[PDB]
Every structure is written in C-alpha cells, then in structure tokens.
C-alpha cells in the first residue's frame, strides 16, 4: 500500500483501488490469477524484455 500516484499518501493506492487474486495446486501442478478493479476501473500491463 503506497501511492502509485506518488502523492506520498499511501492510501490512494492500486491495492486500495482494485482487486486481485492467485491460486495454484500441486496435485494438478497448475496456477491462476484473477483480477478486477473497483468501482468501474480497468487494469493494464506494460512489459519490457520479460
């Protein structure tokens, strides 16, 4: 929890504003994330070299 927006207010944060999750099982050996963003929000990703 910190301001992604950088207001120094660690209360205005991605984790404040959106929702995420993960799951994995070994007896299947398989994983999954599920994500949604609060109150009509979208999420986005930007990769370099990964």
């Amino acid at each position: 929890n910190t301001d992604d927006n950088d207001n120094k207010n660690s209360n205005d944060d991605v984790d404040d504003h959106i929702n995420a999750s993960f799951s994995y099982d070994a007896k299947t050996g398989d994983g999954l994330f599920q994500i949604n963003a609060k109150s009509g929000f979208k999420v986005a990703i930007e990769d370099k070299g990964t």
Binding site: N7, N9, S10
Partner: protein, 50 residues
C-alpha cells in the same frame, strides 16, 4: 505508512509533504475528524495500528 516497510505511522518530512496529503486533512476535518487524543511520533514512529 513507510511503504518500504509498510510501517503505518512513519513521520513525513516537512519539505516533502505533498498537497494531496493535505487534501485528506481538509476532508478529514471537513468530516470533523479530530484526533481523540494527542498522538506523537515515538522516535519518529507510532504503531501501525495507531
């Protein structure tokens, strides 16, 4: 919250305070939020729960 340690209750230096934090203070008293007691930075810290 010092986010590098997530320490809820780490002092914010005078020079660096953003105006966005103040907007919370503005809203906080605008919603009549007053510290029920005086609270002070114990060697620069108050407990995370505090």
């Amino acid at each position: 919250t010092n986010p590098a340690t997530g320490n809820s209750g780490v002092v914010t230096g005078s020079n660096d305070i953003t105006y966005g934090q103040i907007n919370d203070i503005i809203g906080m008293f605008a919603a009549d939020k007053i510290p029920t007691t005086t609270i002070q930075a114990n060697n620069g810290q108050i407990n995370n729960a505090d």
